[PDB]
Amino acid sequence: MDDIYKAAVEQLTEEQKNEFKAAFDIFVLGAEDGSISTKELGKVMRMLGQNPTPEELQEMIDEVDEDGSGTVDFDEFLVMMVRSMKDDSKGKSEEELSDLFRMFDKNADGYIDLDELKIMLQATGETITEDDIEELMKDGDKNNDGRIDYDEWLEFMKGVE
């Protein structure tokens, strides 16, 4: 099966894309792997806008780099454009977040305290100090009432690895 990404690269005349390949051709000019940067692995992963854990990053290479390079080569360079238009598309969705607080409710009411959140980070094995949660909750709850309702939930998931 073909894709709109690889379809464009094959459609771009060698002479046409050559004019755009003069940009990356500069960096790679002094490279042996053919990539633009040796540690570009962390940069290419940013193009997707998702870096929850360093363990999952290794999976990204197998999600986009079927070859196993970890960098945007001459071929990927052309796709880097059509791939940069992936905006307006994240991992979590309002549809999930809705069932998230609902499914993660031991009392099933609509509010999620600070403890209810710990169970989430606990699943990974991590652990913070009482000073982190105390200050953290202050953010999750714009009203700092005591729990995280629907509206509050949407905010609590505004930014936090």
Curated annotation (Swiss-Prot):
Molecular function terms, GO-annotated: actin filament binding; calcium ion binding; calcium-dependent protein binding; protein homodimerization activity; troponin I binding; troponin T binding
EF-hand domain span: 16-51, 52-87, 92-127, 128-161
The keyword Phosphoprotein is annotated on this UniProt entry: yes
Modified residues (N-acetylmethionine): M1
Residues that, per the record, bind Ca(2+) 3: D141, N143, D145, R147, E152
Alphabetically ordered keywords of this record: Acetylation, Calcium, Cardiomyopathy, Disease variant, Metal-binding, Muscle protein, Phosphoprotein, Repeat
Binding site for Ca(2+) 1: D65, D67, S69, T71, E76
SUPFAM superfamilies: EF-hand (SSF47473)
Any single GO CC term annotated in Swiss-Prot or TrEMBL for this entry: sarcomere
BP GO annotations: cardiac muscle contraction; diaphragm contraction; muscle filament sliding; regulation of ATP-dependent activity; regulation of muscle contraction; regulation of muscle filament sliding speed; response to metal ion; skeletal muscle contraction
Sites of Phosphoserine modification: S98
Entry binding sites for Ca(2+) 2: D105, N107, D109, Y111, E116
Associated disorder: Cardiomyopathy, dilated, 1Z: A disorder characterized by ventricular dilation and impaired systolic function, resulting in congestive heart failure and arrhythmia. Patients are at risk of premature death. Cardiomyopathy, familial hypertrophic, 13: A hereditary heart disorder characterized by ventricular hypertrophy, which is usually asymmetric and often involves the interventricular septum. The symptoms include dyspnea, syncope, collapse, palpitations, and chest pain. They can be readily provoked by exercise. The disorder has inter- and intrafamilial variability ranging from benign to malignant forms with high risk of cardiac failure and sudden cardiac death.
Miscellaneous section: Cardiac muscle Tn-C can bind 3 calcium ions per molecule. Domain I does not bind calcium.
Function as written in the Swiss-Prot or TrEMBL entry: Troponin is the central regulatory protein of striated muscle contraction. Tn consists of three components: Tn-I which is the inhibitor of actomyosin ATPase, Tn-T which contains the binding site for tropomyosin and Tn-C. The binding of calcium to Tn-C abolishes the inhibitory action of Tn on actin filaments.
PANTHER family: MYOSIN LIGHT CHAIN 1, 3, TROPONIN C1, SLOW SKELETAL AND CARDIAC TYPE
Family stated for the protein in its record: Belongs to the troponin C family.
Name the record gives this protein: Troponin C, slow skeletal and cardiac muscles
Organism: Homo sapiens
Gene: TNNC1
